């Protein structure tokens, strides 16, 4: 229990960061917000800036849109009675069309109408997002694997609540608004379908949430093990290694037989979180659409 | 069936993802060596990646990997064993070798450049206008060594200015030169800083910079190896 | 069996017991006092479930399983075709985990590394203890802990799951849930990061921290920053862990009924308990 690095002893604070300029056009952008000295045993003090935008605020009134559109429903549930709501919040749910209107955009607001106006917002709000990860890397002039990663997100998104209700051929398949009635369907879900642990992408998936806690323990506590020499500033020691790249790699080696490099070490980590939902999302695509019973379908393989 | 079929690719794709991961984190430190620092004869399965090249900003240099590599400094141990596997006994004092864990690194001797091509650390007293703004301030504390014998006074923080957090005390000896600690390696109190890698008597001893305003990179590894370092060869002035 | 800069790393010194004696490498391994410890406990360990497999007249990987003792054996000892060999195996595994641990402690001690590696393993190991020993022994029971199989495990999972309803209604299961996914969304973006300006766009230059700065900024408003960003990974996954121990230790020890149930203390509040309409009214 030496000086053991998990909380700063002693902050610092300069003349603002308004940050690179690059491509980015500057007029966009927010002023620095509050500085908190609570973040900064932990992290960065400085809130700020953000940059607006046309897609941001396209994104933003649209994601509103969507928490409005269910949160309107939510009132109607309570009777227009805010003890009610308080009371019953978790119990609200906003659900899709009954299985009778198939795919089509004709039901009563009352009975699915409501939820597809909500997903349309919802639809909007993330794409719109996505697009914006994009482009603020594109300003400054940088990878694309951000909006790379975030895609396969989007991707078990999609499948949930749009393409794989679209294969069923109707809305009722998709995804509930509520807290407790989306953990409903999700029990549900793998009951209709013969138990999700015999789906071998549902297991493939849990290897891999599994496998980024245990990898980013393993990256978090290396870099903070190597932090005496500057571990943490990884970008420099990827263009010119120091004793911190050293000492790190040549721990896991002895551990374990191996080890990475800073640069690699980060290539590993982006494709351990992705695999998440990228096995995750087949695993649920193929749910009825080509197997029913997973159990069944294990049984043969055929 | 189309779910066999694509459980049955997926495997094939992670076979061959791992094989491209693999490769990428052999950038550095291959091909592997004998103690004697020639090409091992065993390297395994997984064959070295084609190169490619980092231009660093500023016209720092550019980086190309992987590609032959040297320590480029020369390494004070030698063998204590008749074969494969021992320990290598420094043949001189590790602490002025740079060897063990008080080993450093060739990097440039120039300093890190920021965003802007400022150098990214600084003395507060020099960077307009930064101040402890929060936690026990250590400027004009006593520093103690592990011996509990005060080794200096703290005159100053060095500071990432982008980042904006504290990387090294700047500790006056005895005889009025300073020496840069690593921030990370000390420990603040309300009347003293103490530091429990080094004795009093090895301070006079850290690494010294070329300037009194930037610090290099290189300089930088010398002085983060040499502190760490004192951990286990200070150890005999402990003792207490 | 060196990396190219390996070699002025590896001096005398470090270990924990035994002097000089385990102080080598073997391939790129460490060796050290508990890398023998190690060693011993896992061949213990291998050898018995290799046994359990001889005992149960089978070796495909898909059936072998060990199982603790019945119930009705509390806390006892218990004959080793019984679960005896499930006890010794357990002991076998944690004095393996332990020693890794311990060896890796040898290791940071060598390089002149923090502790914190270990440190973090040491959570999930108290999660493997909290499944298998204390939640057992706070139960009165070994025949609660899991059964060693690679099937087998999910069924046990699934029973003790379903035993108390929709597992989902357990609260602490649900701040374990969320650390998870956070976990995860931060390694994805940590990762993304560090590799996009590393990697920039055709021919330009490797972008700096200040544009990973600014980039999050311009993204979210906020960056937690480089020492930040790698104690959030560490805090997320240690708590997306504590929980789950935290989650498990309470189920049939201080709540055995329905999980869906416990929620009632917040619908049953006397201020709205009778208020018509809603949901649960
Ligand atoms: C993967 C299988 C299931 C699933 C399995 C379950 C299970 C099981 C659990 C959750 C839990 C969560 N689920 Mg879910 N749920 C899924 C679909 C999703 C989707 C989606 C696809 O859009 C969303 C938005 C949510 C989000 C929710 C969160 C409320 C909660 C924490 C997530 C988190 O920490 O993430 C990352 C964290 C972030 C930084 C962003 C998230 C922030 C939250 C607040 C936003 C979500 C909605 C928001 C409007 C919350 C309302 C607040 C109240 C009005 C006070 N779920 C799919 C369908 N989910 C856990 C829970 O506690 O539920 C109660 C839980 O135990
Ligand atoms: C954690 C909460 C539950 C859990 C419920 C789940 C569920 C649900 C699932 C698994 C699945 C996994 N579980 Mg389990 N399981 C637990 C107990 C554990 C323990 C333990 C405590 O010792 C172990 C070793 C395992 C290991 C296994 C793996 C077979 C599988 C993939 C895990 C993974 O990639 O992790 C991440 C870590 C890595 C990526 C590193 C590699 C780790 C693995 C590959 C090493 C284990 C090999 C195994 C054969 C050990 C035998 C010992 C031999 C001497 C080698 N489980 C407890 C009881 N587990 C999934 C599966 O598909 O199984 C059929 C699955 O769907
Ligand atoms: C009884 C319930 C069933 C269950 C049925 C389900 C179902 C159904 C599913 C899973 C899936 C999951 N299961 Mg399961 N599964 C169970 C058993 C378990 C057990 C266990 C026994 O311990 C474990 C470890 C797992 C864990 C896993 C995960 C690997 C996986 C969640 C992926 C994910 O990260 O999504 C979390 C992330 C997302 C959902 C993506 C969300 C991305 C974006 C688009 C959301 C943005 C929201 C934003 C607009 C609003 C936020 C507001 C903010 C404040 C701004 N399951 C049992 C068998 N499981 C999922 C899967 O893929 O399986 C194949 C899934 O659909
Ligand atoms: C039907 C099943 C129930 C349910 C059943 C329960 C039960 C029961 C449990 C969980 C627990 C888990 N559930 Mg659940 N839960 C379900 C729904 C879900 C869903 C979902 C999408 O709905 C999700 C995401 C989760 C996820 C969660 C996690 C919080 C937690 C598992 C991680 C963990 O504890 O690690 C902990 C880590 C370990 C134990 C692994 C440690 C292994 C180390 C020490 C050593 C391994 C070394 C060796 C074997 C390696 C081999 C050597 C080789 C050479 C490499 N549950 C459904 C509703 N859930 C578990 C929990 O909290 O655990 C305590 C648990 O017991
Ligand atoms: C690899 C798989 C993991 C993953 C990946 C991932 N998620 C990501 C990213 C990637 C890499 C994106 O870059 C994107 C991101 O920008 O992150 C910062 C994102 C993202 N994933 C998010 C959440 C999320 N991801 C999910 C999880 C996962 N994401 C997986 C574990 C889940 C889970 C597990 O349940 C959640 C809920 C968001 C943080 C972000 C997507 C942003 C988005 O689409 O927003 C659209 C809608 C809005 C713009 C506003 C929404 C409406 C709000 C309810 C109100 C507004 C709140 C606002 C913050 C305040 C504004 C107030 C003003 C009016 C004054
Ligand atoms: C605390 C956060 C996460 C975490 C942390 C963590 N794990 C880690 C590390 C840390 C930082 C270590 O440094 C250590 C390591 O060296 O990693 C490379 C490790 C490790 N965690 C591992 C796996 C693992 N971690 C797990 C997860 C987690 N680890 C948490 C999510 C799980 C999950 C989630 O299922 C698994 C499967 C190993 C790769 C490695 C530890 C390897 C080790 O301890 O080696 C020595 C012991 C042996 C060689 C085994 C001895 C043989 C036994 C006697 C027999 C086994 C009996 C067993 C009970 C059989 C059960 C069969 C199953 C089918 C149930
Ligand atoms: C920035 O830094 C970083 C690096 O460095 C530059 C690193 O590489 C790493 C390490 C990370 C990776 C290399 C990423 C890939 C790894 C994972 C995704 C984690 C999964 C790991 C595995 C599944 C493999 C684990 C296998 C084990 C446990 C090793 C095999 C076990 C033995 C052989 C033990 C036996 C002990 C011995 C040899 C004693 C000998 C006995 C006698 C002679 C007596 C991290 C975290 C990092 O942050
Ligand atoms: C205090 O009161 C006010 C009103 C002010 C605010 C209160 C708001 C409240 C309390 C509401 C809170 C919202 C809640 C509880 C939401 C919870 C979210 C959950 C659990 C959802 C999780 C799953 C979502 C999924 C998987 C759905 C995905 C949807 C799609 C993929 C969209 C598909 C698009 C469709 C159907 C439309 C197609 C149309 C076109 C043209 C694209
Ligand atoms: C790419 O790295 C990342 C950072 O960027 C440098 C972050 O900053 C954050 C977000 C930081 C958090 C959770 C701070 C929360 C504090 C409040 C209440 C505002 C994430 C996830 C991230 O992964
Ligand atoms: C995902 C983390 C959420 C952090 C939210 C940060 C809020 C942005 C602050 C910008 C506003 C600046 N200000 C106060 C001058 O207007
Ligand atoms: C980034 C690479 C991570 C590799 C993890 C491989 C773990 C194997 C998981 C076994 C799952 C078995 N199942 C059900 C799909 O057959
Ligand atoms: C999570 C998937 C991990 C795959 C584990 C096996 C990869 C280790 C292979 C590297 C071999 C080390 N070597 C011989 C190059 O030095
Ligand atoms: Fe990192």
Request: with cysteine; aromatic share 16%.
């Amino acid at each position: 229990a030496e000086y053991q690095n998990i909380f700063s002893q002693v902050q610092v604070r300069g003349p603002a960061d308004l940050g690179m300029t690059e491509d980015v056009n500057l007029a966009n952008r927010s002023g620095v917000g509050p500085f908190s000295t609570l973040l900064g045993w932990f992290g960065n003090a400085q809130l700020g800036p953000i940059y607006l935008g046309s897609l941001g605020v396209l994104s933003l009134f649209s994601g509103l849109m969507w928490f409005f559109t269910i949160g309107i429903w939510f009132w109607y549930q309570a009777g227009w009675n805010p003890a009610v709501f308080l009371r019953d919040l978790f119990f609200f749910s906003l659900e899709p069309p009954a299985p009778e209107y198939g795919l089509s955009f004709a039901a009563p607001l009352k009975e699915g109408g409501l939820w597809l106006i909500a997903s349309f917002f919802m639809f909007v709000a993330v794409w719109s997002w996505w697009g914006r990860t994009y482009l603020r890397a594109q300003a400054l002039g940088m990878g694309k694997h951000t909006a790379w990663a975030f895609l396969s997100a989007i991707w078990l998104w999609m499948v949930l609540g749009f393409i794989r209700p679209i294969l069923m051929g109707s809305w009722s398949e998709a995804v509930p608004y509520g807290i407790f009635s989306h953990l409903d369907w999700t029990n549900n879900f793998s009951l209709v379908h013969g138990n999700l642990f015999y789906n071998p992408f549902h297991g493939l998936s849990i290897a891999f949430l599994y496998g980024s806690a245990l990898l980013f323990a393993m990256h978090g506590a290396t870099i903070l093990a190597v932090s005496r020499f500057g571990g943490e500033r990884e970008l420099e020691q990827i263009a010119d290694r120091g004793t911190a790249a050293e000492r790190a790699a040549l721990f896991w080696r002895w551990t374990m037989g191996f080890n990475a490099t800073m640069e690699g070490i980060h290539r590993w980590a982006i494709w351990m979180a992705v695999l998440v939902t990228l096995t995750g999302g087949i695993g649920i695509l193929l749910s009825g659409t080509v197997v029913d019973n997973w159990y069944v379908w294990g049984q043969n393989h055929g | 069936d189309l779910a066999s079929l694509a459980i049955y690719s997926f495997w094939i794709f992670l076979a061959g993802l791992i094989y491209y991961l693999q490769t990428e984190n052999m950038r550095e430190g291959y091909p592997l060596e004998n103690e004697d620092g020639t090409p091992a004869a065993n390297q395994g399965p997984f064959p070295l990646p084609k190169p490619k090249t980092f231009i660093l900003p500023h016209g720092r240099g550019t980086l190309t990997v992987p590609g032959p590599e040297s320590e480029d400094r020369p390494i004070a141990l030698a063998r204590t064993a008749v074969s494969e596997g021992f320990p290598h006994a420094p043949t001189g004092d590790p602490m002025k070798d740079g060897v063990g864990p008080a080993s450093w690194v060739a990097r440039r001797d120039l300093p890190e450049l920021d965003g802007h091509g400022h150098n990214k650390i600084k003395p507060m007293k020099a960077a307009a206008g930064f101040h402890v703004s929060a936690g026990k301030n250590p400027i004009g504390l006593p520093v103690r060594g592990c011996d509990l014998e005060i080794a200096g006074k703290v005159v100053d923080i060095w500071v990432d200015i982008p980042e904006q957090m504290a990387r090294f005390l700047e500790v006056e000896l005895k005889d009025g030169s300073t020496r840069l600690l690593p921030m990370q390696m000390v420990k603040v109190q309300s009347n003293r800083v103490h530091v429990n890698a080094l004795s009093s008597d090895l301070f006079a001893g850290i690494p010294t910079i070329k300037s009194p305003t930037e610090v290099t990179l290189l300089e930088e590894d010398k002085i983060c190896g040499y502190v760490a370092g004192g951990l286990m060869y200070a150890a005999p002035k402990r003792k207490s | 069996a060196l990396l190219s800069f390996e070699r002025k790393y590896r001096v005398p010194g470090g270990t924990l017991v035994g002097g000089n004696l385990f102080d080598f490498w073997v391939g790129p391994f460490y060796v050290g006092f508990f890398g023998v410890a190690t060693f011993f406990f896992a061949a213990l360990g291998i050898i018995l479930i290799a046994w359990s497999a001889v005992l149960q007249g089978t070796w495909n990987p898909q059936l072998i399983s060990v199982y603790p003792p019945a119930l009705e054996y509390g806390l006892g000892g218990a004959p080793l075709a019984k679960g005896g060999l499930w006890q010794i195996i357990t002991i076998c595994a944690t004095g393996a985990f332990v020693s890794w641990a311990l060896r890796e402690v040898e290791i940071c001690r060598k390089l002149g590394i923090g502790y914190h590696i270990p440190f973090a393993f040491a959570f999930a190991i108290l999660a493997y203890l909290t499944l298998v020993l204390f939640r057992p022994v706070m139960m009165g029971a070994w025949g609660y802990a899991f059964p060693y199989g690679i099937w087998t495990h999910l069924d046990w999972v699934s029973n003790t799951g379903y035993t108390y309803g929709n597992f989902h209604y357990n609260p602490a299961h649900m701040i374990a849930i969320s650390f998870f996914f956070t976990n995860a969304l931060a390694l994805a973006l940590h990762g993304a990061l560090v590799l996009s300006a590393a990697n920039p766009e055709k021919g330009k230059e490797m972008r700096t921290p200040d544009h990973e700065d600014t980039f999050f900024r311009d993204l979210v408003g906020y960056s937690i920053g480089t020492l930040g960003i790698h104690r959030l990974g560490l805090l997320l996954s240690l708590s997306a862990v504590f929980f789950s121990a935290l989650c498990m230790i309470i189920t049939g020890t201080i709540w055995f009924d329905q999980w869906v149930d416990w929620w009632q203390w917040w619908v049953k509040l006397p201020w709205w308990a009778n208020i018509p309409g809603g949901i649960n009214g």
